[PDB]
């Protein structure tokens, strides 16, 4: 199992990574954009609530 | 839409009738877990009296035993599922003290099971298997326990002991030493919520199905007594 591990390690060693600042910015932008339609985060009136 | 609500209620009522009929069966049956170290004559014990399930009834009480053989791994993460069983049946070959040893591995497994976080209120029924050939190899001078378990040198038979009729006194020492090895682990950390019931079992025994009945009765009685602050 020596050759199998090295071949797998070499396969995933050569990948292109982006800086974590871009990833954090993307996550924050997604959350800010979609925060409007979040019923758990933003409570809904009892007229639109089917469980009340 | 008015009839839709009525249609749902009719189906719900029928289901709840069946659930009541099955709760009586669930509460009137006892679940047992069969566990063994390996090469311990577990198949012989289960036969005489994925996953394999067997059902037997004694004195109009239903018992339902489980044996796991499709999960043969050193680590057991599935053992937290059996936290509501009545008892655990542990089978060990008492004669495997020199073969490669196996007795110490069985003791380590028992210690691991006893101190588990989820099996903190479950008692263990212990079956010390293979007594005839243990006695044979102890009487024969081919090997001695002292060369594998050094603590056996300074062990003496307790005064409050019950030997077999016509039994050689050099077999009783071995039997009681092997039994007390498990009893020490059992009583070291027991808080009073679960005990251990050891037995000496051979190949030709026939009363192995009554011992389980009696031990389960004792388990339930002690549980109730402790619950009502009487024990």
């Amino acid at each position: 199992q020596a050759r199998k591990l090295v071949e797998q390690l070499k396969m995933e060693a050569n990948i292109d990574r982006i800086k974590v600042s871009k990833a954090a910015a993307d996550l924050m932008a997604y959350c800010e954009a979609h925060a409007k339609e979040d019923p758990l985060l933003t409570p809904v009136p009892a007229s639109e609530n089917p469980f009340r | 839409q008015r009839n839709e609500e009525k249609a749902q209620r009719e189906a719900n009522k029928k289901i709840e009738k069946q659930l009541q009929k099955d709760k009586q069966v669930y509460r009137a049956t006892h679940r047992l877990l069969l566990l063994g170290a390996g090469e311990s004559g577990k198949s012989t014990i289960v036969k005489q009296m994925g996953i394999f399930e067997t059902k037997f009834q004694v004195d109009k009480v239903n018992f339902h035993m489980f044996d796991v053989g499709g999960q043969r791994d050193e680590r057991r993460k599935w053992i937290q599922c059996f936290n509501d069983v009545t008892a655990i049946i542990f089978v060990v070959a008492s004669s495997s003290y020199n073969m490669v040893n196996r007795l110490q591995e069985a003791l380590n497994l028992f210690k691991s099971i006893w101190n588990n976080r989820w099996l903190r209120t479950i008692s263990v029924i212990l079956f010390l298997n293979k007594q005839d050939l243990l006695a044979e190899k102890v009487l024969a001078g081919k090997s001695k326990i002292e060369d594998y378990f050094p603590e056996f040198a300074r062990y003496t038979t307790p005064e409050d002991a019950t030997p077999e009729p016509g039994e050689d006194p050099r077999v009783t020492r071995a039997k009681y030493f092997i039994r007390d090895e498990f009893l020490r682990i059992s009583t070291a950390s027991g808080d009073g919520r679960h005990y251990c019931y050891p037995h000496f079992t051979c190949a030709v025994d026939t009363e192995n199905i009554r011992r389980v009945f009696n031990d389960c009765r004792d388990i339930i009685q002690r549980m109730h007594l402790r619950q009502y602050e009487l024990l």
Binding site: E12, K22, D26, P50 | -
Partner: protein, 332 residues
């Protein structure tokens, strides 16, 4: 000798490659935003009828029906709105560890300690297929489509099945411990798994080989879930920590832990937007986190035993929790 030395050099290159990427922590950018505040939720429904503890639960795609599994040997389909039982399937084997609900709503999966996955037909209820080939207990299963399904088992292997023929189309290998959970991507092109060797891997469904590996934990991983975006996921182990990983950056971003909790974690789940992270614990309750700040925002209490299941509706309207008290609760 040569093989061990070669592997060590390759691993060191990977570790230092991602050390240069980290120029700022996630909390550093998100340090300048207002908090969500205090979030209070109240139980809306309580579902009774199971005779024993509950290990699994899955919401329906219509956000109205859900299925649950229990140790007494039943598989009940509910109706959260009107609180009416619709179906009740008796299982051949009492020991069941997972359940799934088909996206089309025409099938339900099941599995456990018998090493068999069963598919039930709801619009005809009886067994439609039994999938065999795993050498260990099943831990999770998810429906890719109406004719294929991916499963994880305790023999350190995941597999992709074909319901029509009952054969393994492809098999995934590379873990060294029991695989405990998996989760599918929104496009169903990739999926992740978490094992008992404290590692999570990313797989390719069509090609069939691993892509990346993440090893930030120090104990067995019990839960996993993608971010709604599809470029991140969160895991939870029994060392009382939840961690967030990023697919493109190939490293973890933030950890969620407190010094007053020492129990394990049984389930995690996100919300509709991804701002909240809901995690179930062994302390008989549930915790609500802030994904971009790592501070508690609420507590869900009311169960008398450990919480074993957790889920959020596809529209993000309610949360369902199951526990060993044989009860299901809906929160809002």
């Amino acid at each position: 000798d040569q093989l061990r030395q070669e592997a060590e050099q390759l691993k060191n290159q990977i570790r230092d490659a991602r050390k240069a990427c980290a120029d700022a922590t996630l909390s550093q950018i998100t340090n300048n935003i207002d908090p969500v505040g205090r979030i209070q939720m109240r139980t809306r429904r309580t579902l009774r009828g199971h005779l024993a503890k509950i290990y699994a639960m899955h919401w329906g795609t219509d956000s109205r029906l859900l299925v649950s599994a229990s140790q007494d040997g039943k598989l009940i389909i509910w109706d959260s709105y009107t609180t009416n039982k619709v179906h009740a399937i008796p299982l051949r084997s009492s020991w069941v560890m997972t359940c799934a609900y088909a996206p089309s709503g025409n099938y339900v999966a099941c599995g456990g300690l018998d090493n068999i996955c069963s598919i039930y037909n709801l619009k005809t209820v009886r067994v439609s297929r039994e999938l065999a080939g795993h050498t260990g207990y099943l831990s999770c299963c998810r429906f890719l489509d109406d004719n294929q399904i991916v499963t994880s088992s305790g023999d350190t292997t995941c597999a992709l099945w074909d319901i029509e023929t009952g054969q393994q189309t492809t098999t995934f290998t590379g873990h060294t411990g029991d695989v405990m959970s998996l989760s599918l991507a929104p496009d169903t092109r990739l999926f992740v798994s978490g094992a008992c060797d404290a590692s999570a891997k990313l797989w390719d469904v069509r090609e069939g080989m691993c892509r990346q590996t993440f090893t930030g934990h120090e104990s067995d991983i019990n839960a996993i879930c993608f971010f709604p975006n599809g470029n991140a996921f969160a895991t939870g182990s029994d060392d009382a920590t939840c961690r967030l990983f990023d697919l493109r950056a190939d490293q973890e971003l933030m950890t969620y832990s407190h010094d007053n909790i020492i129990c394990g974690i049984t389930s995690v789940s996100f919300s509709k937007s991804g701002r909240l992270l809901l995690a179930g614990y062994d302390d008989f309750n549930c915790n609500v986190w802030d994904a971009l700040k790592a501070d508690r925002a609420g507590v869900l209490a009311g169960h008398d035993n450990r919480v074993s299941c957790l889920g959020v509706t596809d529209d993000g309207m309610a949360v369902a929790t199951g526990s060993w008290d044989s009860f299901l609760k809906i929160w809002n």
